Design a protein around this ligand. Structure first.
Ligand SMILES: *[C@@H](CO)COc1ccc([N+](=O)[O-])cc1
Ligand SMILES: *[C@@H](CO)COc1ccc([N+](=O)[O-])cc1
Lengths: 99, 99
């Protein structure tokens, strides 16, 4: 199945049972979500994007249900204006960019 | 043909004959390049990303050669740390996200 990119490619994902609307982004190496609570077992990171960088909390082996599959992967939480699933997860889901 | 996302999906594009290395990004609505010179016929814009927003120069109907096709589309130039082709162009190229 595939997303045609006329509209933003957005899905609903369950991260540790919490539902979140995420943008699937081939231009992110990482995934970063906000408004989810995931533990005190994190390592601090800073990731950069267009306007500069942000502080994040890297959480490993989180549980994620999306597109009828349950995968485990690294998620960061931080003050992103949009939740994205980077390439770290898109590869876990077998996604390719096709033309 | 398709990109498998184990590596960043990067191509070389010719924009008004200038070669530029670009990241194909399904999470960008817009394309923004730096280090290219494109005219004084632009409209000012500001686009936001992760660390905040940036000032851009929107140029319309620019000439772009990429993946064996010559398309025309809107390109912005501004101080991006990475050059990306947003969804405005990926649709011009018939790209879908497949799984
Ligand atoms: C597309 C979605 O906004 C942009 O992706 C990136 C911007 C900046 C960087 N970086 O500075 O490393 C990577 C990806
Ligand atoms: C993925 C590549 O870095 C991120 O894409 C976006 C970040 C932020 C926004 N926004 O604030 O509208 C859009 C896309």
């Amino acid at each position: 199945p595939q997303f045609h990119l006329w509209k933003r490619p957005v899905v609903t994902a369950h991260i540790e049972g919490q539902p979140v609307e995420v943008l699937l982004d081939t231009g992110a190496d990482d995934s970063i979500v906000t408004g989810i609570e995931l533990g005190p077992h994190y390592t601090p990171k800073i990731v950069g994007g267009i306007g500069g960088f942000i502080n994040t909390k890297e959480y490993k082996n989180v549980e994620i249900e999306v597109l009828g599959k349950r995968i485990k992967g690294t998620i960061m939480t931080g003050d992103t204006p949009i939740n994205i699933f980077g390439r770290n997860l898109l590869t876990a889901l077998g996604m390719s960019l096709n033309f």
